[PDB]
Design a protein around this ligand. Sequence first.
Ligand SMILES: *[C@@H]1O[C@H](CO)[C@@H](O[C@@H]2O[C@H](CO)[C@@H](O)[C@H](O)[C@H]2NC(C)=O)[C@H](O)[C@H]1NC(C)=O
Ligand SMILES: *[C@@H]1O[C@H](CO)[C@@H](O[C@@H]2O[C@H](CO)[C@@H](O)[C@H](O)[C@H]2NC(C)=O)[C@H](O)[C@H]1NC(C)=O
Ligand SMILES: *[C@@H]1O[C@H](CO)[C@@H](O[C@@H]2O[C@H](CO)[C@@H](O)[C@H](O)[C@H]2NC(C)=O)[C@H](O)[C@H]1NC(C)=O
Lengths: 50, 57, 7
Amino acid sequence: ALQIPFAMQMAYRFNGIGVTQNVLYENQKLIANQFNSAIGKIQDSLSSTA
Amino acid sequence: REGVFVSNGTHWFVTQRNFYEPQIITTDNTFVSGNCDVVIGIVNNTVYDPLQPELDS
Amino acid sequence: LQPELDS
Ligand SMILES: *[C@@H]1O[C@H](CO)[C@@H](O[C@@H]2O[C@H](CO)[C@@H](O)[C@H](O)[C@H]2NC(C)=O)[C@H](O)[C@H]1NC(C)=O
Ligand SMILES: *[C@@H]1O[C@H](CO)[C@@H](O[C@@H]2O[C@H](CO)[C@@H](O)[C@H](O)[C@H]2NC(C)=O)[C@H](O)[C@H]1NC(C)=O
Ligand SMILES: *[C@@H]1O[C@H](CO)[C@@H](O[C@@H]2O[C@H](CO)[C@@H](O)[C@H](O)[C@H]2NC(C)=O)[C@H](O)[C@H]1NC(C)=O
């Protein structure tokens, strides 16, 4: 395991989908939010569903 | 442009990510996008422009 | 390059 800062790991995962890494660093707050919100919807779905 | 910016504690280099091979940072090792105002964790350092000393003649 | 070829 080689440590790497999580925002720089996500910048490489953006290169892996053909989106240039500056698109992450220039939008990082908006990608960190909306990830956090999409995880909150997993809790709400699993809490409410049957 | 491809690789990582790293520092040995005093100087900044760009390396490929899967093997440590450091290069001096240059205007063709790298690409520009926007101001320094936006990026969380940007650092201040020189970028060498290889054309400028040639075009000085 | 062409602006720098003003040199
Ligand atoms: C890209 O989409 C996001 C939403 O996915 C937009 O961000 C929202 O902008 C409005 C502006 O009134 C805010 O009310 C929301 O709170 C924002 N959402 C988030 C998650 O921050 C963004 O403006 C869009 N950008 C472009 C260029 O269209
Ligand atoms: C970080 O790397 C630089 C460049 O290799 C090191 O500085 C050079 O060290 C050599 C050998 O000691 C000297 O001949 C040069 O004059 C140094 N300067 C430059 C700009 O090349 C630097 O010492 C390294 N830092 C650490 C903490 O190891
Ligand atoms: C990185 O470089 C910029 C520009 O050289 C520095 O910004 C200046 O900082 C001084 C002291 O805070 C201010 O008086 C200037 O008004 C700033 N100029 C601009 C354009 O913002 C910045 O401080 C440097 N960053 C670090 C961490 O050293």
